[PDB]
Ligand binder design. Structure first.
Ligand SMILES: Cc1ccc(C(=O)Nc2ccon2)cc1NC(=O)c1cnn(-c2ccccc2)c1N
Length: 336
């Protein structure tokens, strides 16, 4: 298009990006799009460039491509990853088959920090406060991260955090979303924050489950087996049958689990790691907790503008998802 694009082979795939993006070096992947660390000639900054993997080769991928670009273009928050640029080597909609997304390049994720260190309490407060500040904003647009974990929580140390793969791995998942979605809310992310926070304070994974049944066993040893009040609210027969079959376990006192931690941290952990999603603290409420008195500013915890996600209910053809994505690429304006 307007810039001159250059081709190269990175990993076992062809990358075709503009001349402003130089020295592309792989970082990592998954099953949705590998990322390269790059140098922005125009800004003099290091960027992260993601090439979407076969964006329009399936109905699930085509809608996922749209979803991701809509999510990225909408979210404008300090603790939430943001879109710097979006491009395609394609000059028209007929040749459109590749999507590239550009963000800032972060220094490290939360797995890296906990390996090379044993964090302090102010360190934990600032990290957790930032994650919560970002989730309040995400949750206000009616989006649940659903897969919050240390690998999608990244820092540009300093110690300034950004949440990565929000609206679309076992150790940080809410128990309700483990044993078939027996009704769920946004606090599904709060359970994950609890798991992350506990790991930041102890240096060890809270529940390192070897499988989906062992994961549940580990969760229940700390939080206890579901009580009378909770069991009554479970409509799924198979889920109730499963719960009823486990030997009764009491809920542990978190003061005897998190030995030496700030008492305010322990109180907060108890509020986040509650079995009942109905009783679990929210992002906005957690930001008001005393543990964050040094960081909390109710005038500096913004919410998101309204986000139209009616598209989520719509069943379209690959080429309709493609055209809709094509419009979001063309219409894009940098932050700057
Ligand atoms: C380029 C890109 C495109 C999309 C998203 C993204 O979050 N997408 C979605 C999808 C839905 O909602 N958001 C993130 C990125 N950036 C990174 O992945 C990224 C940036 N810095 N590091 C990094 C570098 C070194 C260590 C740790 C992290 C990364 N892993």
């Amino acid at each position: 298009e307007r810039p001159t694009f250059y081709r190269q082979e990175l990993n076992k795939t062809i990358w075709e990006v503009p001349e402003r993006y130089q020295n592309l070096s792989p970082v990592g992947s998954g099953a949705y799009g590998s990322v390269c660390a790059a140098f922005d000639t125009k800004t003099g900054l290091r960027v992260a460039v993601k090439k979407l993997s076969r964006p329009f080769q399936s109905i699930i991928h085509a809608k996922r491509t749209y979803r991701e670009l809509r999510l990225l273009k909408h979210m404008k928050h300090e603790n939430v990853i943001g879109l710097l640029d979006v491009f395609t080597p394609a000059r028209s909609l007929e040749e459109f088959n590749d999507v590239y997304l550009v963000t800032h390049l972060m220094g490290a994720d939360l797995n890296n920090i906990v390996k090379c260190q044993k964090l302090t309490d102010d360190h934990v407060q600032f990290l957790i406060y930032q994650i919560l500040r970002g989730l309040k904003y995400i949750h206000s647009a009616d989006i649940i991260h659903r897969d919050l974990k240390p690998s999608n929580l990244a820092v540009n140390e300093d110690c300034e955090l950004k949440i990565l793969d929000f609206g679309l791995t076992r150790w940080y998942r809410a128990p309700e979303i483990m044993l078939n979605w027996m009704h769920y809310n946004q606090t599904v992310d709060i359970w994950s924050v609890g798991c992350i926070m506990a790991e930041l304070l102890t240096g060890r994974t809270l529940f390192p489950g070897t499988d989906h049944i062992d994961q549940l066993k580990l969760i229940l040893r700390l939080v206890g087996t579901p009580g009378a009040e909770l069991l009554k609210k479970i409509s799924s027969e198979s889920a109730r049958n499963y719960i009823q079959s486990l030997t009764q376990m009491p809920k542990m006192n978190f003061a005897n689990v998190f030995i030496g931690a700030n008492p305010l941290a322990v109180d907060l952990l108890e509020k986040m790691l509650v079995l009942d999603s109905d009783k679990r603290i929210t992002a906005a409420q957690a930001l008001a907790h005393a543990y964050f008195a040094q960081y909390h500013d109710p005038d500096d915890e913004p919410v998101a503008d309204p986000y139209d996600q009616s598209f989520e209910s719509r069943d379209l053809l690959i080429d309709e998802w493609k055209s809709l994505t094509y419009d979001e690429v063309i219409s894009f304006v940098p932050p700057p």
